[PDB]
Curated annotation (Swiss-Prot), chain A:
It comes from the Viruses. Residues 98-111 are annotated as: Fusion peptide. Residues 1-447, 469-475 are extracellular. Binds to host cell surface receptor and mediates fusion between viral and cellular membranes. Envelope protein is synthesized in the endoplasmic reticulum in the form of heterodimer with protein prM. They play a role in virion budding in the ER, and the newly formed immature particle is covered with 60 spikes composed of heterodimer between precursor prM and envelope protein E. The virion is transported to the Golgi apparatus where the low pH causes dissociation of PrM-E heterodimers and formation of E homodimers. prM-E cleavage is inefficient, and many virions are only partially matured. The chain holds residues 281 to 772 of 3414 of the full protein. The chain crosses the membrane at residues 448-468, 476-492. Glycans are attached at N154. This is Envelope protein E. It is found in: Virion membrane; Host endoplasmic reticulum membrane. It comes from Tick-borne encephalitis virus (strain Hypr). Disulfide bonds join C3-C30, C60-C116, C60-C121, C74-C105, C92-C116, C92-C121, C186-C290, C307-C338.
C-alpha cells in the first residue's frame, strides 16, 4: 500500500451496486478505494510528463556585451548612425550629447549620439519555457492492490500495475494477479489546463535549484526580458537588460543590468515546482479525473483455509497510521496459504467486531502477507489476530475523525477541488448540482479576481464590504455578500 | 525592467512551492521596513489617530493603507 | 530575501546617475499594468465614483490610492 | 521524510541593481574610490592676481 | 585612496556539503556537527515518517538539513565608509590665457 507512505490520503467507500467510482487523482496524493465485497485498491496520479515538449519563448537573464561602438555628431551636421544599428542581436539607443569644442563641433547644443553593443546572452542563463501538448502528454496512474504484503519506498511492489495515459489511449484492463482486473477510464485534457500551463526551466545542471516550475501563460508572456525561440541566432527585446546613461559630449556609456535570476526567483512566490528527468519533464503538482471501475474485482483467497489461531506472531507492532487508522504486520508460521481471522473488539465487555477493515479478507501468501490496515472507533480496543491479541487505545475522537474528514474536504477544495466535485459518483441533486453551484461561481471568480493578489483579495473585498456599510438603498445592501465571498473563498 | 510576481497567478498546488509562508509576509516585513527604519514616522502616524481624525471606524482604513502604500 | 530601493536616500546628483528617468516610472508602468491587463477590474473602479458616497475631496484620495495599492 | 531539499536563491545582482534607481554613480580608478557628485565651500582670493 | 570597508554582502550563495538528518517521530531529533560552524545554515522541521523509510512508528518525524553557505567569486557587495584623513578634494583652476 503506497497510500500509507504519504500524508495526503483519501478513503472512498464502495456500496453493493456502486462499481464505477469516479475519482479525481491528485498529484502527490493517493486514494484508497474500499468496497463491500471487493478487495481494496490504491489508485493515484503518479506522474505527469511529456518527452521533450515544444519549447516556447526562451529568455536571457545575464547579458553578454561586447564590441561597444559609440558614434556622436554635432547638432546640425547629420545625426549619428552606425552599421550595427540595424544588425541582429544589437541593442542601440539614440540620444543627444552636449557638444562643446574639445570634441570639435562648430556649434553648441544637442549633438546626436548613439551607442551599440553586440548584446548576446551569457551561457547557461537561459530561462527556457515549455508547454504541454495534449496530443503527446502522459499521465501515469500506478495501481497497487492491498495484497497483505508490504513494500517500502526503496523497493517496488510486484503486483503494483502501471498504465500510461495519453490521448492515443483510453482505459486499461490491468491484470491484478488473481484479484480480478481493474479499469481506469482517465481523461487527458480535463486534468491540468495545458493551454495556461508553462514549464519554466532554468539551468537544470545547477545543483541547488528546482529543475522546473509550472507558471501561468499570460504571466509567462508578460515578462520584460529578452526573448527568442529555438535556433534564433539573435534576441527580441534585447534592450530590456542593457541600459545607457546620459553621455558626456563624446561617449555614452553602457551599463548592463547583470543577472536577473533572483528577480525571477522572487517572482515565482507560490508556484508549484516541476521535475526534469532527462527527456521527461514531470510535474510535481496536478490532478486528473480518472473514473475507476471496480467491475472485474473479486476477493482473492476466499477458497483459502483459515490459519491456525495459535501460530500468529507480530512481525511489527500496531501503531497509528497518521490517518486515524491502525496498521500492523503479522507473520503466520503454519500451513500457507490461509486467511487471517482479524477482528477488533471495543473493550466494553463486547465480543463485537468493530474492525472497519481497510483491507478486507487479509491473507497470508506463500511468499508474503500480513500487512493489515483497519480503522477503529475511539477508546480501548483489542485487535485479535486469531488468538494473538494486543491492546490499543485509539487516539482519535468520536466527532474528531468526522471533523478530520471535513478538514480534508475543505483543503481538498483548492483549485484542484474547484474542479473536483466529481469525487463522488453522479449524486444528481447532490453532486451534479454541486458542479453547477461552484463552476459558475469559481469560473466567474477566475475570469475576474484571477491576477489580483492576496493584498487586494484581503483588502478590496473588505473595502467593498465597507461600501456595503456605506450604502444608501437598503435593497442594495446585499453588496455585504462580498464580505462573505471575498474574505473566505479566495483566501486559502 | 520589471518582472511581476505570482501574487497574480496562483494556479494550483499539492507538490512543493517556493515561499508560501513568505509571499504574504514579504509585504509584512516591508511594513517592518517602514516602521523599524522610520520610528519617527511610527510616532507621526499616532497624531493621525487621536488629534486629527475623530473617526474611529475609518482610522484603521487610514493607518493600514498608508503603511501598505509605502512599497 | 528583501531589499528596499534607494528611493529613501536620493542624496545627491549632478554628475552621472542611474535610471531616475525610469525609476518613478517603474510604478507608472506597474499601475498601467494593472489597468491594461485587468480591464474588467479597471472598469469595476467606476462603480465607486458615481454610485457610492462621492464627496468631492474624497473621490481621488480613494481612487488613486486603490489603484496604487496593488503592487 | 528523508531529504529536506535546500534551494539557493541564485544571484541577486540585478535585484540590487533595481534598488539603485536614483543613485549617483562612483568611479574606481584602481586605488582611488572616486565620487562623481558632491559639494564643498571654498574661498577664492583674487587680490594676488593681475 | 583605499579607505576602510564595512559589511559586504554575497549576492550569489555558494551552497556546499548539503546533508540532511532525519529520524522517526520519537527517535531523537538528530544532532549535526555542521550546525556549529559559522557560514552554515540549518533549519529544524517536522516531516512525516512512514514505513517506506524503515521506521517503527508514524507521526511527526523530526528532520534537519544543513549546508555550508560560502560565496561565489567576485560576487561581493562591498560597502565602504569615509575617513576624512585620506579624503581629497581636487580643484583645478584655469585662467583665460587666450588659448
Ligand atoms: C532499501 O533497502 C536496504 C536494504 O536493507 C535498506 O538498508 C535501505 O535503507 C533502503 N533504501 C533506502 C533509500 O532507504
Amino acid at each position: 500500500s503506497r497510500c500509507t507512505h504519504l500524508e495526503n490520503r483519501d478513503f472512498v467507500t464502495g456500496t453493493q451496486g456502486t462499481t464505477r467510482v469516479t475519482l479525481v487523482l491528485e498529484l502527490g496524493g493517493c486514494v484508497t478505494i474500499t468496497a463491500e465485497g471487493k478487495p481494496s485498491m490504491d489508485v493515484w496520479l503518479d506522474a505527469i510528463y511529456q518527452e521533450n515538449p515544444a519549447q516556447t519563448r526562451e529568455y536571457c537573464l545575464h547579458a553578454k556585451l561586447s564590441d561597444t561602438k559609440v558614434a556622436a555628431r554635432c547638432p546640425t551636421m547629420g545625426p549619428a548612425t552606425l552599421a550595427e544599428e540595424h544588425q541582429g542581436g544589437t541593442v542601440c539607443k539614440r540620444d543627444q550629447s552636449d557638444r562643446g569644442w574639445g570634441n570639435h563641433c562648430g556649434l553648441f547644443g544637442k549633438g546626436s549620439i548613439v551607442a551599440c553593443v553586440k548584446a548576446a546572452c551569457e551561457a547557461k542563463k537561459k530561462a527556457t519555457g515549455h508547454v504541454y501538448d495534449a496530443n503527446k502528454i502522459v499521465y501515469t496512474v500506478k495501481v497497487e492492490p492491498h495484497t497483505g504484503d508490504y513494500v517500502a519506498a526503496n523497493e517496488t511492489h510486484s503486483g503494483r500495475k502501471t498504465a500510461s495515459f495519453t490521448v492515443s489511449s483510453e482505459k486499461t484492463i490491468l491484470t491484478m494477479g488473481e484479484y480480478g482486473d481493474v479499469s481506469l477510464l482517465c481523461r487527458v485534457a480535463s486534468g491540468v489546463d495545458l493551454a495556461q500551463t508553462v514549464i519554466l526551466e532554468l539551468d537544470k545542471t545547477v545543483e541547488h535549484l528546482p529543475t522546473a516550475w509550472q507558471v501561468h501563460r499570460d504571466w509567462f508572456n508578460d515578462l520584460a526580458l529578452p526573448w527568442k525561440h529555438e535556433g534564433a541566432r539573435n534576441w527580441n527585446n534585447a534592450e530590456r537588460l542593457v541600459e545607457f546613461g546620459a553621455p558626456h559630449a563624446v561617449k555614452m556609456d553602457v551599463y548592463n543590468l547583470g543577472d536577473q535570476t533572483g528577480v525571477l526567483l522572487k517572482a515565482l512566490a507560490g508556484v508549484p515546482v516541476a521535475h526534469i528527468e532527462g527527456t521527461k519533464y514531470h510535474l510535481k503538482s496536478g490532478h486528473v479525473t480518472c473514473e475507476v471501475g471496480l467491475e472485474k474485482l473479486k476477493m482473492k483467497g476466499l477458497t483459502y483455509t483459515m490459519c491456525d489461531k495459535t501460530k500468529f506472531t507480530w512481525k511489527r507492532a500496531p501503531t497509528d497510521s497518521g490517518h486515524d487508522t491502525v496498521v500492523m504486520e503479522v507473520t503466520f508460521s503454519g500451513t500457507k496459504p490461509c486467511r487471517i481471522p482479524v477482528r477488533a473488539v471495543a473493550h466494553g465487555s463486547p465480543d463485537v467486531n468493530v474492525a472497519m477493515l481497510i483491507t478486507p479478507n487479509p491473507t497470508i501468501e506463500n511468499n508474503g502477507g500480513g500487512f493489515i490496515e483497519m480503522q477503529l472507533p475511539p477508546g480501548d480496543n483489542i485487535i485479535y489476530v486469531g488468538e494473538l491479541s494486543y491492546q490499543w487505545f485509539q487516539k482519535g475522537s468520536s466527532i474528531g475523525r468526522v471533523f478530520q474528514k471535513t478538514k480534508k474536504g475543505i483543503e481538498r477544495l483548492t483549485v484542484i477541488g474547484e474542479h473536483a466535485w466529481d469525487f463522488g459518483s453522479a449524486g444528481g441533486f447532490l453532486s451534479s448540482i454541486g458542479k453547477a453551484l461552484h463552476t459558475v461561481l469559481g469560473g466567474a471568480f477566475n475570469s475576474i479576481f484571477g491576477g489580483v493578489g492576496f493584498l487586494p483579495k484581503l483588502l478590496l473585498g473588505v473595502a467593498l464590504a465597507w461600501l456595503g456599510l456605506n450604502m444608501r438603498n437598503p435593497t442594495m445592501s446585499m453588496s455585504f455578500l462580498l464580505a462573505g465571498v471575498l474574505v473566505l473563498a479566495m483566501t486559502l | 525592467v520589471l518582472i511581476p510576481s505570482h501574487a497574480q497567478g496562483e494556479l494550483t498546488g499539492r507538490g512543493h512551492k517556493w515561499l508560501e509562508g513568505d509571499s504574504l509576509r514579504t509585504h509584512l516585513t516591508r511594513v517592518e521596513g517602514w516602521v523599524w527604519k522610520n520610528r519617527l514616522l511610527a510616532l507621526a502616524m499616532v497624531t493621525v489617530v487621536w488629534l486629527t481624525l475623530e473617526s474611529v471606524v475609518t482610522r484603521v482604513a487610514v493607518l493600514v493603507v498608508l503603511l501598505c502604500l509605502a512599497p
